[PDB]
Design a protein around this ligand. Structure first.
Ligand SMILES: Nc1ncnc2c1ncn2[C@@H]1O[C@H](COP(=O)(O)O)[C@@H](OP(=O)(O)O)[C@H]1O
Ligand SMILES: Nc1ncnc2c1ncn2[C@@H]1O[C@H](COP(=O)(O)O)[C@@H](OP(=O)(O)O)[C@H]1O
Lengths: 248, 248
C-alpha cells in the first residue's frame, strides 16, 4: 500500500522528508537531492514525467502539497493506505513566504501586501510558486476529515511543525511508528542528521556543486494584525482549523 | 480516442496549438490562456494536479514536449489514437534558447557556451526550463519510428515548422485532415488568427492584464560551426534525423 507525507507549503516538509529518509537508510543524508530520492515530492516527479506505480505491493513514501482531491492523485485512490499530515501555524507560513521571496522585515509595503493577500486567500492560492495546494484549510480538510472522499482506505496522522520542534525524537517516532517503519533507535540518529545546522550545510554544499535546490506579526501591524485576528476568529474553515490545532 | 500534439521545445508548439484551438472554436483566440484551454499542454495540467482521463469516449487534443516514453504517459498507453509530431531545424531551436534566455547575438561567450552544450547534449537536456524532453533525436524517435513502443494503437503525422511557415493553410489542413477535425474553410481563418503579429499582440495583452505567459550560426562561428557540422554529419541519431527532415 501507498503513503503520503502531505503538508501545506512552508510547514516544514523538507525537514520531515529529510528525517524520514535518514531513518529508512539509517545513513545520514549525504546530498540535498538525497531527500527527493528518499521521500519523493510528487510535483517533482511529474515535472520530469515520472509517476510512481498505483498500488505498489510494498510500502511506498511520497510527499505532496497538492490538496488530496486534485485529479492527478485519483490514480492512487484505492492504494493509499496512510497519510501523515504535516501542519504548521498559518501565521508562520505567511512570514515564511516573505523570507522566501527576498524582502527584509522592513519593506512593509511589500509585506503588508503579501499578508493582506494571504488573508483574503486564506493561504497561498495567489502565489505562482505552488499549484493545486488550496488554501490552508481547504488543504488540511482535504487530507484529514474529508480524506476518505479521495482515499477511502486511508488512515491519517496529523503532526504539528511546532510539536516536531519542541521534541523532534518523540514526534518523529510517532510518525515512524504510525508508518510501521521500524524501531526507535534509528529515530535519535535520524533527528540529528537533519538539523537547522545540518540542513543549511547539506543545502549549500549542493548549491555550490551546481545542484538543484529549494518572529510574529507586530511589525507592519496595528491593522494587518486586526485583519488576521478577525479571520483567525471568524466562522470560516481557516479559523476552525487554527482553533483545532492550537494556533488560536 | 486520445491525440497528442508532440513537439521538442522551440519547434513552434504554441503557434500550432493556437491554430488548432482556433480551428476547433472557429472563433479567434481572444486570450493567451485560451491556447492552454484549447489544446492543453500536459506539463501545465500536471503542475496543478489536473490530469485528463485515460480513454475519453470522444476525441481529445493534448500537447507535450515529453518524450513519448516518460512513465507519466503510460496511463494513455492504449487510448492514444494519433500523434502530430512537430519538428523544426535543431539549429534554430538552439538559436531560440538564446533569444529566450535574454542574450543579444553578441555575447559570444554566453552563446558559444549554450551551443557547445546543446551539441554535446544533442538538444536541450541540460536546460533547467524543460524536463523529460530528451535530446532532439531521442524525442523525435520516441514519437515516430518507435511510437508503438509507448502507444501501440498510434498513427503519426510529422509536420515541419519550416513547412508550416512556407504554407500555413496547406500544412495546417493536413493536420486538421489527419486529426479528422473537419472542413478546410476554417483553416484559412484559423491560420490568420495566429500570426507572428497576432501572437505577439495576443501575448502582451495578457501579460499586461496580469496573466500567466510563456539568422544562422556564422556569428560566434568558425569552430562552433565546425563542431555542429561534424555532429550534423556523424553516425549519431541526431544526424540521422537532421538528414531525414531536410536540415542536412
Ligand atoms: N532541519 C530543520 N529543522 C527545523 N526546521 C526546518 C529545518 N529545515 C527547514 N526548516 C524550516 O521549515 C520550513 C520549510 O518549509 P517547507 O520545507 O515545508 O517548504 C522553513 O520555515 P522558515 O523559513 O519559516 O523557518 C524552514 O526554515
Ligand atoms: N504565430 C506564429 N507564427 C510563426 N512562428 C511563431 C508564431 N508564434 C511563435 N512562433 C515561433 O515559434 C517558436 C516558439 O516555440 P515553442 O512555441 O515550440 O516553444 C519561437 O521561435 P523563435 O523564437 O526562434 O522565432 C516563436 O518565435
Amino acid at each position: 500500500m501507498m503513503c503520503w507525507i502531505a503538508s501545506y507549503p512552508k510547514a516544514g516538509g523538507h525537514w520531515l522528508r529529510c528525517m524520514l529518509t535518514s531513518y529508512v537508510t539509517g545513513e545520514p543524508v549525504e546530498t540535498w537531492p538525497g531527500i527527493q530520492a528518499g521521500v519523493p515530492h510528487l510535483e517533482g516527479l511529474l515535472r520530469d514525467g515520472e509517476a510512481p506505480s498505483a498500488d505498489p505491493d510494498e510500502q511506498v513514501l511520497l510527499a505532496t502539497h497538492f490538496t488530496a482531491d486534485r485529479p492527478v492523485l485519483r490514480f492512487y485512490r484505492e492504494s493509499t493506505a496512510k497519510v501523515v499530515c504535516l501542519i504548521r501555524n498559518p501565521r508562520d507560513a505567511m512570514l515564511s513566504l516573505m523570507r522566501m521571496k527576498g524582502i527584509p522585515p522592513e519593506d512593509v509595503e511589500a509585506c503588508r501586501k503579501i499578508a493582506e493577500t494571504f488573508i483574503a486567500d486564506e493561504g497561498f492560492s495567489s502565489v505562482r510558486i505552488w499549484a493545486g495546494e488550496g488554501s490552508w484549510p481547504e488543504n488540511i480538510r482535504s487530507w484529514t476529515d474529508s480524506v476518505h472522499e479521495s482515499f477511502p482506505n486511508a488512515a491519517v496522522l496529523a503532526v504539528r511543525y511546532e510539536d516536531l520542534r519542541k521534541d523532534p525524537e518523540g514526534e518523529l517516532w510517532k510518525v515512524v511508528d504510525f508508518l510501521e517503519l521500524g524501531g526507535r533507535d534509528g529515530v535519535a540518529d535520524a533527528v540529528a542528521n537533519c538539523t537547522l545546522e545540518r540542513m543549511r550545510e547539506m543545502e549549500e554544499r549542493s548549491k555550490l556543486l551546481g545542484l538543484e535546490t529549494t518572529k510574529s506579526l507586530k511589525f507592519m501591524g496595528d491593522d494587518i494584525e486586526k485583519a488576521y485576528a478577525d479571520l483567525l476568529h471568524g466562522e470560516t474553515d481557516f479559523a476552525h482549523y487554527a482553533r483545532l490545532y492550537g494556533y488560536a
